[PDB]
Design a protein around this ligand. Structure first.
Ligand SMILES: [Mg+2]
Ligand SMILES: [Mg+2]
Length: 548
């Protein structure tokens, strides 16, 4: 297998002398603005330089990034904008897009990034304010900022929840249901429940997402080294610790690539660069070599056919999976993504495997089925930004039609999730069986389409927790976690709790909430049989500050 080669027609590369950049980006946006489930994919890439009079509007399945080693190398006098015009001001479906490695001088002083899930904002320098809300302050369900510097105020306004890590902000305007911060210089003080700020001084461990850049005229991928007890940006005081890999050390995956070829590339020592597109596989992609980077551009998507697993990472150190959507096929897959083997017991603390900006979809673009979406077997794994989503709208949706029982199952020890979003599973959205797990920020919605109370009976419990720590676990800790319900098929359904965990000194939670959306169903409790039920139709959270 040969490494390197052209990035293909879905990677649009601009430099400051490119004619009609605005017209080019506008045409991508015209096509992608409302294209929620289409198969088209785009990566917009900007060579280092200064770009004037630019407003890059970002639609579905569109990534935008600069190609400098540092964010300020690629500067827009202008904006990278997501708004909600196509949905009449409602931003709750602004999914599957990304911005990375750019500096912005927004034209009116404020850049708008009004997104919901799977819309990461990484390694950005906003020289102004950042507005996360749609014009008109309608509903929005974000969001994720990492390794970024916002010189002025971040204004969430109507954003329901948000996670920011390892960043610097000049100010922070408000909280709604759950704004969580770890390692954020300028974060508002811990104040939950009012305002609902969950604030941690540092992030226990983080490792910034690898990214494509240009070293002179040569393409390379920069691979940041890990930080322990991280705080502030990695690039603020100049280039961080990390390694650069030349593009010729990557198999550049395009249409036509089989799992057999991809697997052969990894076995031969090549890393993986998935150009934007949709890749069907008839057997799992297997990454069994330590330190392999598997990096996707433009929301590159993998669909497993015939019920196979899409991606299996072996029991090795340092695998970095980033920027991929795994989209279930119509034939049920027992698992979509497995990190490590069943029973994996190896230590990877010094050099963990990570999933970053890995998104899963079951249904919505056609019928899709999977029993468990992500199984994390390997000890020390970092899950840093994931959205694992059983579709509630689109094509191929139904209680059976797109049944997906379990979202994420964590079996490894010392696993860390930062920015965990899991929604709509028929049974437990997240289950955690390994020891010493930590979650910083969780957002869940319960399945809308349970037909009746019996359909979600869980032994002698009504409903399955959105986040379940197994009763055998001795040590676990979670911060800033919310579960919301919208039982619209049968609003008489009651969900016993959002969270379930054993009662032990080393199993702790901080800042939990449950919310009924418009009275469609209600929660009886917050965690276990503790905390007040939700009531009425006005969407007021029920909260618990500390457990146990
Ligand atoms: Mg939503
Ligand atoms: Mg174990």
């Amino acid at each position: 297998v040969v490494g390197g080669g052209d990035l293909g027609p879905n990677v649009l590369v601009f430099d400051p002398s490119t004619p009609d950049i605005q017209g080019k980006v506008d045409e991508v946006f015209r096509k992608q603005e409302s294209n929620q489930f289409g198969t088209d994919r785009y990566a917009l890439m900007f060579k280092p330089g200064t770009y004037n009079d630019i407003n890059a509007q970002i639609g579905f399945y569109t990534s935008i990034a600069g190609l400098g080693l540092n964010p300020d190398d690629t500067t827009f006098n202008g904006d990278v904008t997501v708004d909600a015009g196509w949905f009449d001001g409602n931003a709750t479906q602004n999914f599957w897009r990304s911005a990375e490695n750019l500096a912005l001088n927004p034209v009116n002083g404020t850049n708008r990034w009004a997104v919901s899930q799977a819309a990461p904002f990484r390694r950005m320098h906003v020289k102004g304010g950042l507005n996360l809300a749609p014009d008109g302050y309608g509903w929005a369900s974000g969001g994720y900022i990492a390794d970024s510097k916002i010189d002025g105020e971040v204004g969430p306004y109507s954003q329901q929840q948000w996670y920011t890590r390892d960043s610097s902000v000049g100010g922070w305007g408000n909280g709604v249901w759950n704004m969580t911060f770890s390692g954020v210089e300028g974060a508002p003080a811990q104040s939950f429940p009012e305002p609902p700020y969950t604030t941690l001084e540092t992030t226990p461990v983080s490792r910034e997402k690898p990214f494509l850049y240009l070293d002179g005229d040569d393409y390379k991928v920069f691979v940041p080294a890990k930080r322990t007890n991280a705080r502030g940006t990695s690039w603020g005081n100049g280039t961080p610790e990390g390694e650069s890999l030349p593009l010729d050390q990557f198999y550049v995956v395009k249409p036509g690539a089989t799992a057999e070829t991809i697997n052969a590339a990894v076995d031969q020592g090549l890393h993986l660069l998935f150009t934007p597109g949709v890749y069907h596989v008839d057997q799992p992609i297997e990454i069994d070599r330590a330190n392999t980077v598997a990096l996707g551009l433009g929301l590159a998507t993998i669909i497993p056919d015939n019920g196979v697993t899409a991606l299996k990472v072996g029991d090795v150190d340092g695998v970095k999976v980033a920027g991929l959507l795994v989209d279930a096929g119509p034939v049920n897959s027992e698992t979509l993504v497995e990190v490590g083997s069943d029973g994996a017991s190896g230590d990877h603390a010094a050099n963990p495997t990570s999933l970053q900006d890995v998104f899963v979809r079951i249904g919505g673009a056609g019928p899709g089925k999977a029993t468990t979406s992500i199984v994390v077997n390997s000890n020390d794994t970092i899950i840093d930004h994931t959205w694992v989503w059983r579709a509630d709208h689109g094509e191929g949706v139904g209680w059976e039609t797109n049944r997906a029982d379990y979202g994420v199952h964590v079996k490894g020890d010392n696993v860390l999730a930062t920015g965990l979003f899991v929604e709509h599973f028929n049974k437990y959205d997240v289950q955690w069986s390994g020891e010493n797990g930590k979650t910083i920020f969780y957002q869940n919605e319960k399945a809308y389409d349970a037909p009746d109370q019996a359909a979600i009976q869980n032994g002698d419990i009504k409903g399955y927790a959105a986040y379940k720590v197994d009763d055998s676990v001795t040590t676990h800790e979670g911060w800033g976690m919310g579960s919301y319900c919208y039982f619209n098929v049968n609003p008489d359904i009651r969900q016993q709790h959002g969270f379930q965990a054993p009662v032990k000194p080393g199993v702790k939670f901080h800042d939990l909430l449950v919310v009924s959306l418009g009275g469609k169903g209600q929660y009886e409790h917050v965690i276990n049989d503790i905390g007040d039920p939700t009531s009425g139709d006005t969407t007021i959270p029920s909260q618990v500050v500390s457990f146990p």
